[PDB]
């Protein structure tokens, strides 16, 4: 008794070039599962038309993963000179307890490295100052490197929020409501890697391991140029 997302037109082409997965690594739905009306308690769409992703447990997601029509995964030159853009609306509604961190978006490379994670927290600490129920991101600053570089974009509301992702020639753009709040930060550490773009839940850290993560998408498309 869900209903999928499918069923709304302004999710057609998105659902189109992705895969689900859930909760962990393994695609539970591809494009044409997604397309066929795919749904669940963790990937479904609320009555004001919102596609919602849920999750419970330490790292596990309910997450899409870019993909080509062709069925290809998405392996672009993350330092290429062609850009890539991700946009996404997001309500991000107030966690429950027990809930710390909850990955939105991400840029990931073919292996095993997040390029960027845009991130609610609960808490950050960045070079001395703390933040509390902020929206971040955060680019590693090398496969070799387990450590990021973070910066706060938005204080945290329940309200819609558009998000941008530009990623082109070594460089990485956010924008926030049509704000830049990250200014093409470097990301040529990742030069020789692929990357594909990510959307959903990500549960990082949580200190109750049965709360749900939950994060609502009202629009969201990725997109190539030139
Ligand atoms: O030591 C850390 O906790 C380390 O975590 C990093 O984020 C990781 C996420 O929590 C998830 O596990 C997944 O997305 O992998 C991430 C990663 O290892 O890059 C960063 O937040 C990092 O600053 C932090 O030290």
Redesign the pocket.
């Known amino acids: 008794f869900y209903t999928a997302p499918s069923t709304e037109s302004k999710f057609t082409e998105v659902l189109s070039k992705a895969k689900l997965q859930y909760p962990t690594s393994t695609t539970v739905a591809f494009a044409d599962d997604l397309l066929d009306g795919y749904a669940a308690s963790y990937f479904y769409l609320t009555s004001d038309l919102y596609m919602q992703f849920q999750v419970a447990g330490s790292?596990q997601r309910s997450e899409l993963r870019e993909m080509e029509t062709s069925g290809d995964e998405a392996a672009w030159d993350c330092t290429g000179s062609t850009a890539h853009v991700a946009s996404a609306q997001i309500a991000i509604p107030v966690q429950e307890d027990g809930i710390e961190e909850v990955?939105i978006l991400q840029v990931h490379d073919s292996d095993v490295?997040?390029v960027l994670?845009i991130s609610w927290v609960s808490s950050i600490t960045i070079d001395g100052v703390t933040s509390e129920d902020v929206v971040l991101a955060?680019i590693?600053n090398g496969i070799d490197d387990?450590?990021?570089t973070?910066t706060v974009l938005q204080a945290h509301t329940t309200s819609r929020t558009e998000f941008n992702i530009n990623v082109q020639n070594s460089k990485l753009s956010i924008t926030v409501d049509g704000t830049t709040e990250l200014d093409e930060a470097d990301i040529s550490q990742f030069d020789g890697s692929t990357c594909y773009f990510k959307a959903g839940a990500?549960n990082?850290?949580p200190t109750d391991t049965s709360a749900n993560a939950r994060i609502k998408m009202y629009e969201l498309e990725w997109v190539d140029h030139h």
Request: no cysteine.
């Open positions: 790292s990955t490295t997040p994670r955060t590693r387990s450590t990021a973070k990500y990082n850290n």
